[PDB]
Amino acid sequence: MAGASVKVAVRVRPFNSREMSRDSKCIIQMSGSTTTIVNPKQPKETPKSFSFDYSYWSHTSPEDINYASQKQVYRDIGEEMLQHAFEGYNVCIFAYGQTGAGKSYTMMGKQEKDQQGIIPQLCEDLFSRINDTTNDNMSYSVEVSYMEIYCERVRDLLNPKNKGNLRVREHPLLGPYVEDLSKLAVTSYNDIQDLMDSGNKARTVAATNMNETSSRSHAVFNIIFTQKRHDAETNITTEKVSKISLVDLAGSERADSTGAKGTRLKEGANINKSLTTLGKVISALAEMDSGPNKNKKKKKTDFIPYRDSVLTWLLRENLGGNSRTAMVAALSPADINYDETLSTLRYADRAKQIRCNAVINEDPNNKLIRELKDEVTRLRDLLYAQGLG
Amino acid sequence: MRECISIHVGQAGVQIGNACWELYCLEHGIQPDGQMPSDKTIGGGDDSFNTFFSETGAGKHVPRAVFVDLEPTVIDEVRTGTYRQLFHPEQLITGKEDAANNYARGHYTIGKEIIDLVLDRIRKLADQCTGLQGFLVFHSFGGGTGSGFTSLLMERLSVDYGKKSKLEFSIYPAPQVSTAVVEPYNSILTTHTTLEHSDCAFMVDNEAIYDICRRNLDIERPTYTNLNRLISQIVSSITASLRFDGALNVDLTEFQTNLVPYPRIHFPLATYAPVISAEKAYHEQLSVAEITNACFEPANQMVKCDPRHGKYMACCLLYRGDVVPKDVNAAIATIKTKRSIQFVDWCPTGFKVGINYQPPTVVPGGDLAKVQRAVCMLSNTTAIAEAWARLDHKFDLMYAKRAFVHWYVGEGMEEGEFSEAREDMAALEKDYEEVGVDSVEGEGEEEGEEY
Amino acid sequence: MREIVHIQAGQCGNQIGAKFWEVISDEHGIDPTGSYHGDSDLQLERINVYYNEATGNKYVPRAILVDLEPGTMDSVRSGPFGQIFRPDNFVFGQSGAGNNWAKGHYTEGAELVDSVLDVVRKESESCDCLQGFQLTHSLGGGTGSGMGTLLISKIREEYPDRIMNTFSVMPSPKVSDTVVEPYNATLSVHQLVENTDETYCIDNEALYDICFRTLKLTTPTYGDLNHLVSATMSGVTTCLRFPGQLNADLRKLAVNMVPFPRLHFFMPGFAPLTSRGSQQYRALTVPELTQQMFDSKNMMAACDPRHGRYLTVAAIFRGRMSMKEVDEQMLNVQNKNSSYFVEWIPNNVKTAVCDIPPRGLKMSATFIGNSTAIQELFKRISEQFTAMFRRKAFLHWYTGEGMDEMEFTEAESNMNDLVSEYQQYQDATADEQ
Numbered sequence A: 001m002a003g004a005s006v007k008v009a010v011r012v013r014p015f016n017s018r019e020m021s022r023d024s025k026c027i028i029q030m031s032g033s034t035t036t037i038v039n040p041k042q043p044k045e046t047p048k049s050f051s052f053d054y055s056y057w058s059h060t061s062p063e064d065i066n067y068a069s070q071k072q073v074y075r076d077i078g079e080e081m082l083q084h085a086f087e088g089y090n091v092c093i094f095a096y097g098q099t100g101a102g103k104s105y106t107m108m109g110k111q112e113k114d115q116q117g118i119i120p121q122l123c124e125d126l127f128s129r130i131n132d133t134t135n136d137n138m139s140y141s142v143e144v145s146y147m148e149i150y151c152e153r154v155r156d157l158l159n160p161k162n163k164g165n166l167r168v169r170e171h172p173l174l175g176p177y178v179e180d181l182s183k184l185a186v187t188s189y190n191d192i193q194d195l196m197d198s199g200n201k202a203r204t205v206a207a208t209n210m211n212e213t214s215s216r217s218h219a220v221f222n223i224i225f226t227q228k229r230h231d232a233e234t235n236i237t238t239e240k241v242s243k244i245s246l247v248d249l250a251g252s253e254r255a256d257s258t259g260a261k262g263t264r265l266k267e268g269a270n271i272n273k274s275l276t277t278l279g280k281v282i283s284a285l286a287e288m289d290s291g292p293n294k295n296k297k298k299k300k301t302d303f304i305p306y307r308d309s310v311l312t313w314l315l316r317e318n319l320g321g322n323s324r325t326a327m328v329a330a331l332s333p334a335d336i337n338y339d340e341t342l343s344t345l346r347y348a349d350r351a352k353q354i355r356c357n358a359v360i361n362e363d364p365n366n367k368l369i370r371e372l373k374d375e376v377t378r379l380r381d382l383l384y385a386q387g388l389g
Numbered sequence B: 001m002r003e004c005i006s007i008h009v010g011q012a013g014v015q016i017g018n019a020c021w022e023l024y025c026l027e028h029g030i031q032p033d034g035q036m037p038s039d040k041t042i043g044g045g046d047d048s049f050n051t052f053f054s055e056t057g058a059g060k061h062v063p064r065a066v067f068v069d070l071e072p073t074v075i076d077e078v079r080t081g082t083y084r085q086l087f088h089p090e091q092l093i094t095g096k097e098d099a100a101n102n103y104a105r106g107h108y109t110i111g112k113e114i115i116d117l118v119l120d121r122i123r124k125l126a127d128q129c130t131g132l133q134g135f136l137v138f139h140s141f142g143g144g145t146g147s148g149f150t151s152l153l154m155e156r157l158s159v160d161y162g163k164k165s166k167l168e169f170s171i172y173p174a175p176q177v178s179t180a181v182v183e184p185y186n187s188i189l190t191t192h193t194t195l196e197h198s199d200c201a202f203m204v205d206n207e208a209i210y211d212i213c214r215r216n217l218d219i220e221r222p223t224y225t226n227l228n229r230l231i232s233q234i235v236s237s238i239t240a241s242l243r244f245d246g247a248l249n250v251d252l253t254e255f256q257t258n259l260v261p262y263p264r265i266h267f268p269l270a271t272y273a274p275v276i277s278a279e280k281a282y283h284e285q286l287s288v289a290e291i292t293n294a295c296f297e298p299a300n301q302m303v304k305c306d307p308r309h310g311k312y313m314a315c316c317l318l319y320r321g322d323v324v325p326k327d328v329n330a331a332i333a334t335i336k337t338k339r340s341i342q343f344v345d346w347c348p349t350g351f352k353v354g355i356n357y358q359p360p361t362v363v364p365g366g367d368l369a370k371v372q373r374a375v376c377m378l379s380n381t382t383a384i385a386e387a388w389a390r391l392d393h394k395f396d397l398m399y400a401k402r403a404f405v406h407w408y409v410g411e412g413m414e415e416g417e418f419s420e421a422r423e424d425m426a427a428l429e430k431d432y433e434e435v436g437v438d439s440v441e442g443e444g445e446e447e448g449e450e451y
Numbered sequence C: 001m002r003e004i005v006h007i008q009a010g011q012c013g014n015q016i017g018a019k020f021w022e023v024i025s026d027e028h029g030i031d032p033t034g035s036y037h038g039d040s041d042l043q044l045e046r047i048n049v050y051y052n053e054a055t056g057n058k059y060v061p062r063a064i065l066v067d068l069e070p071g072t073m074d075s076v077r078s079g080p081f082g083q084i085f086r087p088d089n090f091v092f093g094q095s096g097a098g099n100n101w102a103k104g105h106y107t108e109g110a111e112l113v114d115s116v117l118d119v120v121r122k123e124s125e126s127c128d129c130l131q132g133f134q135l136t137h138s139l140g141g142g143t144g145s146g147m148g149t150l151l152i153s154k155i156r157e158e159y160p161d162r163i164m165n166t167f168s169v170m171p172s173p174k175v176s177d178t179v180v181e182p183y184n185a186t187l188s189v190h191q192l193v194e195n196t197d198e199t200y201c202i203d204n205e206a207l208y209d210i211c212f213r214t215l216k217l218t219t220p221t222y223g224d225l226n227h228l229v230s231a232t233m234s235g236v237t238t239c240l241r242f243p244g245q246l247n248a249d250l251r252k253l254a255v256n257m258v259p260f261p262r263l264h265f266f267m268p269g270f271a272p273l274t275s276r277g278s279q280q281y282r283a284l285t286v287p288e289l290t291q292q293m294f295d296s297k298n299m300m301a302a303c304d305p306r307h308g309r310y311l312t313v314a315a316i317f318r319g320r321m322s323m324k325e326v327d328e329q330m331l332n333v334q335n336k337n338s339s340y341f342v343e344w345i346p347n348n349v350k351t352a353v354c355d356i357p358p359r360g361l362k363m364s365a366t367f368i369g370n371s372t373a374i375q376e377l378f379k380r381i382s383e384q385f386t387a388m389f390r391r392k393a394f395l396h397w398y399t400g401e402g403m404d405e406m407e408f409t410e411a412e413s414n415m416n417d418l419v420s421e422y423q424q425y426q427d428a429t430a431d432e433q
């Protein structure tokens, strides 16, 4: 048992074909750990500002200077998370965003493999490290599961049966789980990605006023990783069991953006409730992580509202206890989608909420005038001193 | 034809409308069934004033009113009441549930499928009107309907009509007293619409009116009827300038030209001076000076805020009855010499005056005494900041733990419409703090050229 | 038009429902034969909340009676108001659950739930604008608990956006009538915590205390307890049926009373209550009603509020009264007892007023509290449950009906988590680290 510190990272995407075809203007600026945004409809008022753990400028893909390369973000998040998984403890990766921002790129990456996402690289490193340590005394096992949560009802994405609502149980020692959840073994990342495509074809997706293909239900691809050791003895014993969770979120929305009734309103409301509960639990976990980490005290165990949603309930083991987590959030550079980008920031700011301060860029003219006035004063005080004035 | 369309939203709006329309019917001699026997007894006249009532062929008079709510109960009380024949049968009442102290339920989910009918009937009323002056919207902060549906309706009206004035009378939450646990959320979420779209918003507090009733009228156990009657008197004093002749008449545009220095500070307080019981109506002169002084007493304010802690930015006095200009001039002159009343240094005039000949009426069964003179003061000041600040604190105490939030997000909103509103409140308070500061000393720093 | 479907399962639920329909029919002036003979014209204005109209200018309630034993149905029919109910809403079987939760939920109730759902759906489809459902049952029993939980689960599956109330009679430490109370109570709470919007906590111990010490009844019987309960249920939804100065729907109560989804267990109370001869000695005023409502002995849950903090409270007054008195009294109650109210809610007293009082009274009031102290109740059940589950006292009677040992553990863990959630907002500061 240990902390659950959360690493917050935000990346911007380049202009798509439609945006580059138009004369749309960029609106996101980044510097250090700060990201600032300007209203196109109120250019006179002020920019808004936010501060995250990592700001990534992937606006220009071929660029080298201050370019957020895929390998850089991997080394920042995925490599450390995979190492923590290999140590024998759980880890989880949250993908949050809205259609247009481009979350699925960073969540998967392109097929060319020169520009890869977190997941294919993680799978490659996982199986490379596994195959590079298969000595005589060590045995390794890996298996994968894939399931969705739609309107707080769990469904299986791989099994082709009727998409019924699976039952959620609580094993006394192993925690929450889902009954009749098909679990398959894998040996190469090609099989993992093929299963991913097969399951992604089965997702529940509906057309919105924002995009014609939007995720209407949360989805998780969970990797269970078991290590067995054979000491100088007749017994082969499982050392540790760790999990790598790859959670995909359905982004928030407003009824104004999609003013449709019936199923759409219910889906949006349930998604928003799930996001609110998830943010609350992650914020409480981060606060408890920060507190003891510096104080080393044990203020009981707090109360973490896991049960308020099935999403947080299933991910109880990965969220809490000893673990490490990191949420990646995608943005959109188009001015027209301002209401989306700022909204994502308000969700990305949650958990590890830190002071942002105001980004100040003084006028060069005023700076020059002030510097020259100070220089005149200094030189006059020097000359009057040596009785030369 | 100085026509004005009244809109009533929510239970508070409908009940204040009942009081207001009782007073209006009594003022012009209209019976509850819409007939006016005064013209028949006399022979003819202009007594069917087109400000509020529209005359049909058969001598009936239909009010220019629009009642809206989501509960059938509050307006079914009116459909089978004393005034059932006065109103048009169309009352725009959704036969469903209510916003349930939920801004999201009233703005996004259930506010739809009733807004279209309301806008259609408002258009039908506006088509009959020539030279429409503006709108008078009655609602209440802290309620689901009066917040969400009022926001939606104001947005649509600003989109459609645009240039017509839109005055607002709203019941603000009291500092201590309250009737709901989620009042602060609904109150804060309405700032965007009450700021961006309205032209002038008048706020009243139930605690202040209860104090006034207990102390002045000697009513130990008031109900909402007395409060609605007082608010009706206020609105009648505001609107009388365009119904009756007078020495100096103040239209609804002079209001906005004189009272709001900048677009974002249009939140004036209101007060009524000669609030006195019948027994205490004797032993008192009720001259212009007395009522004018009583308008400035902090005890008589209709919102729990002390003007002594702020600065007066603009004042508008509206007198009714046997009043003459020279008494008003003397009252203003003696007021300007008091050091307890401070005006901003950048408004040296600081007063707008209007006079009307028609004295105020007395409702049978009421509690206000018959008087010869009256005055209603509307005062744009900076003390109103306090009224926001307390409420702002309350909001924080609930939003730190995200209490009661799942109800709001389950209807269409996300958490950001819950922060954006808070930031807008903070910006408004900063503006009110900035405007009231005295001009910097010799505002051109200092000056003096050769000669 | 807000309309409520009433369901009553088990002996306790059926008896309370019969008394409740007696009370409501008296309030709306309905004859036992179903005709109307009232006097005030406002009684028919909102009669469609509970009653359907029938061709002979008759009125029939929307009650749906359920029981796995036909004796209680025979008792209900052979009663003062038996003829009022529709014959087709008497859904029942034979070979009752026999105090076995498994039989009520899995084996026996699973076959009758289809017929009950058919009747419920038939009543639902004829409703102009349905608001919610009501259920009356006993957690510590057999058919009532299991079938009520199963019906709640099915209905919430079918009607997710509708309100669901529950007037559940939970067991007591001292007054216990069945030996397998803890298992049934635990397994029932495990479902109620998830699939219910509002739950009202009732137990016979508090009602007996009220009868002994307030009404001064020498020999109270179940009729009087049902009378008090029925008074509460009629008080809760008064604003749907009669006009008011400040209305309060069921959804308004749910929004104002429930801060978080899992905290929806309420402590009910009613005022005034006087013992006949004492009636002339005490005046009826809003201060007296407020004093009696917040008194510790008036609660019908056997949980002392003084051992916790009120997360929220709601008051529904009936009668012609001044709003200033109500607001002043609630503010005074909040200010004086500052230590018994949670600090991080600025104002946690909802108030509603209705003009029309009960028939023979000038003023009345209903009180709905939500305080941390309710955890005590759950704790007591847990304190018994483990004491029987550790040794598997009567477990085989359950496992022979399809159930499993893991499910008991999930129920216990869920109740413990609920108790912890209530317990967190219960200490009167959090400063030290």
Ligand SMILES: CC(=O)O[C@H]1C(=O)[C@@]2(C)[C@H]([C@H](OC(=O)c3ccccc3)[C@]3(O)C[C@H](OC(=O)[C@H](O)[C@@H](NC(=O)c4ccccc4)c4ccccc4)C(C)=C1C3(C)C)[C@]1(OC(C)=O)CO[C@@H]1C[C@@H]2O
Binding pocket: C022, C023, C026, C027, C215, C224, C225, C227, C228, C230, C231, C232, C234, C235, C272, C273, C274, C275, C276, C279, C358, C359, C360, C361
């Ligand atoms: C006539 C009069 O002034 O006498 C009262 C009376 O003496 C008292 C003691 C009544 C009386 O109640 C009881 O004795 C009683 C006994 C056991 C359990 C519950 C009540 C009364 O019986 C009860 C009766 O109440 C009503 O009629 C209400 O409308 C009540 N309905 C019924 O009791 C009822 C009974 C049979 C069939 C149908 C309805 C009600 C309460 C809440 C919501 C709706 C209706 C009243 C006025 C009285 C008597 C007759 C003595 C009380 O009744 C209530 C619950 O309001 C008990 O304490 C109150 C206060 C009253 O002072």
Ligand SMILES: Nc1nc2c(ncn2[C@@H]2O[C@H](COP(=O)(O)OP(=O)(O)OP(=O)(O)O)[C@@H](O)[C@H]2O)c(=O)[nH]1
Binding pocket: B009, B010, B011, B012, B013, B015, B016, B070, B071, B098, B099, B100, B101, B102, B139, B140, B141, B142, B143, B144, B145, B146, B171, B178, B179, B180, B206, B224, B225, B227, B228, C245, C246
């Ligand atoms: N002065 C005055 N205030 C009132 C009156 N009626 C209600 N209010 C105020 O309104 C607040 C409650 O909100 P409401 O306006 O009643 O909400 P609503 O219009 O019924 O809309 P819903 O919440 O959906 O039912 C209370 O806090 C009161 O202070 C009234 O008759 N006179």
Ligand SMILES: Nc1ncnc2c1ncn2[C@@H]1O[C@H](COP(=O)(O)OP(=O)(O)NP(=O)(O)O)[C@@H](O)[C@H]1O
Binding pocket: A011, A012, A013, A014, A058, A059, A061, A097, A098, A099, A100, A101, A102, A103, A104, A105, A106, A251, A330
């Ligand atoms: N750093 C990046 N560099 C280049 N392209 C990017 C980058 N981030 C995102 N993208 C784009 O993201 C697109 C894929 O996502 P897109 O189709 O825009 O939304 P989506 O993924 O389908 N919905 P969502 O997953 O919620 O964001 C690709 O066409 C990429 O061009």
Ligand SMILES: Nc1nc2c(ncn2[C@@H]2O[C@H](COP(=O)(O)OP(=O)(O)O)[C@@H](O)[C@H]2O)c(=O)[nH]1
Binding pocket: C009, C010, C011, C012, C013, C015, C099, C138, C140, C141, C142, C143, C144, C145, C169, C176, C177, C178, C204, C222, C225, C226
């Ligand atoms: N208030 C009240 N409670 C009752 C009544 N009958 C039984 N109970 C309670 O209900 C419990 C028994 O449950 P029971 O009604 O037999 O459940 P059922 O067999 O499913 O109908 C006991 O602990 C009693 O306290 C009644 O008439 N009134």
Ligand SMILES: [Mg+2]
Binding pocket: B010, B011, B071, B098, B145, C247
């Ligand atoms: Mg209402």
